């Protein structure tokens, strides 16, 4: 119904995602805006369309793979606990929910509401222990927005903008190719998003894997000569050498470190000592530092 | 191809569980057998059919939904970064498996071929940092059986005895009925799985609450009078009643603890002061106690 297969619901009340209460306490099951990063292993929901009714979804735990429905029939707490959907309107169980979008052609804001109530879910507080579950209130929209959701489709952390983009160092400065001792090497000590020598194009394989092609260059970046990534390579999609592979560690949306395949070590900012080598792309630590953080700017 | 759709793997070598490695390290994205407990959210795997070749199977992480391929074309690393399946048996990410039952008959205990390199899996460690992650290590069964995995089906971890059935309390007594100044409790003062009094069976519903009933009196547990729990119930299936309820919060396989639905707290042993009313269920716990952890016990 417009909602992603696969997703996570942050609250624009406190910035939180949705994420399965796992503690032994009585909240346990409940669904709590908790969790600060979209990673969190509990904050994943699956969308499930509705058999009969056109409009209607039914929304599970990733990581329990039961479906939300009411605590009890006493309670408007929402358990991510029913072994099977239940379409029926009139029981208490009834797990269909339908999401209504808070502005028209924005699918990524929405509020759901439960079906056999009626009611809004909010990110709901009553006090001690019940902070921040989801719940549902009432057939009135809430004064203090605490039933917006922001929708995040959870395949798209993991997909990049092809078409031009550059990264961003840790240092401010955007990745150019630039010439040092005969290499054509990349380095970050650009300024400006506009110059030619700044845009790359990322190629995400079928098997995960990532090719970059430098725009201006028009050779694949690779690793090679010292562990500096040049920019001399052919098409890795038909060569499949791993000096020219890389794979990702995506730490937020745009926020990644990239591990070359050849050497298995991340890339990252590099000053060698070496004359002329500032600030250039090596794969020089085995574990992910600050100067192997990249941001990818799109273009 | 046998394999339960979703999955927990365990090494055999070392009794931890097969589980995504989130950790930002060289080895991000590959599979560490280090879950100490199946409840960790990183180590649910789904299984797919292969589409034209009958036994094969594709398998991928529950957390990043991605399918388990090798590192590179030089790695027999298996990561869980897979876009697609790839069902080319000459490409070297292929990520078709050959689940391979090691007694005939028994689908609980397996080796896992990688189809392409026609090796088998292994826990394997290569010393510093490669410690116990799965390697299709070569055509040779292992001497130390690090290629052997139990496999355990994620959804049973929830379901329960179908049958007769007892619990056991921390005081290493049975749970059962016995009347007290007339009201019919349940009491952890049993020695002997024989006696009548000590039999109850379990009813999950679709929607995930739960309502005993004791055998012996033929009636269903209900929280009542001072929060005890009582054996005067009546199907709650079809009364609907909140105090006839329970949800669980599963520790591990048949160690439970359950969750009244009328007054949201635990049922624990407890002693109150009253005269004889001494290790009697009780409502009487917020969140997991020692008192509150029930042992299922099987008739």
Redesign the interface.
């Known amino acids: 119904a417009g909602l992603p297969v696969?997703m996570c619901l942050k609250s624009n009340n406190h910035q939180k995602y949705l994420r399965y209460q796992?503690d032994?306490?009585?909240q346990?099951?409940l669904l709590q805006f908790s969790a600060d990063k979209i990673?969190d292993?509990?904050a994943?929901f699956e969308v499930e369309p509705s058999k009969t009714y056109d409009g209607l979804v039914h929304i599970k735990s990733?990581?329990?793979?039961?479906y939300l429905?009411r605590?009890?029939?006493?309670?408007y707490w929402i358990?991510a606990?029913?072994?099977?959907p239940?379409e029926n309107k009139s029981n208490?169980?009834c797990t269909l929910f339908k999401p209504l979008y808070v502005e028209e052609g924005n699918m990524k804001k929405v509020r759901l509401l439960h079906v056999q109530l009626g009611h809004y879910t909010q990110n709901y507080t009553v006090g001690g222990?019940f902070v921040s579950y989801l719940f549902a209130e009432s057939s009135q929209i809430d004064t203090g927005s605490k039933d917006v959701f922001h929708v995040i489709d959870?395949?798209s952390i993991?997909q990049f903008p092809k078409g031009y983009v550059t990264f961003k160092g840790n240092n401010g400065k955007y990745l150019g190719v630039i010439t040092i001792n005969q290499l054509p090497c990349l380095q970050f000590g650009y300024d400006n998003l506009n110059d030619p020598k700044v845009a790359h194009q990322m190629f995400?394989?079928?098997?995960?894997?990532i090719c970059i092609k430098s725009n201006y260059m028009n050779k694949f970046w690779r690793l090679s000569t010292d562990d500096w990534i040049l920019v001399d390579g052919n098409d890795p999609r038909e060569t499949?050498?791993?000096a020219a592979?890389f794979?990702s560690?995506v730490?937020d949306f745009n926020v990644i470190?990239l591990?070359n395949?050849?050497k298995?070590?991340?890339i990252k900012r590099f000053t060698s000592g070496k004359p002329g080598f500032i600030n250039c792309m090596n794969a020089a630590t085995?574990?992910?530092d600050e100067t192997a953080i990249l941001e990818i700017i799109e273009l």
């Open positions: 696969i796992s032994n306490i009585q346990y099951g990673l292993p509990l994943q990733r990581y329990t793979n039961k429905v605590w009890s029939p006493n309670h358990t606990s029913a072994n099977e239940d208490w169980a222990s959870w395949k993991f995400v394989t079928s098997n995960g894997t499949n050498e791993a592979l794979r560690d730490h470190s591990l395949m050849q298995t070590w991340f085995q574990n992910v």
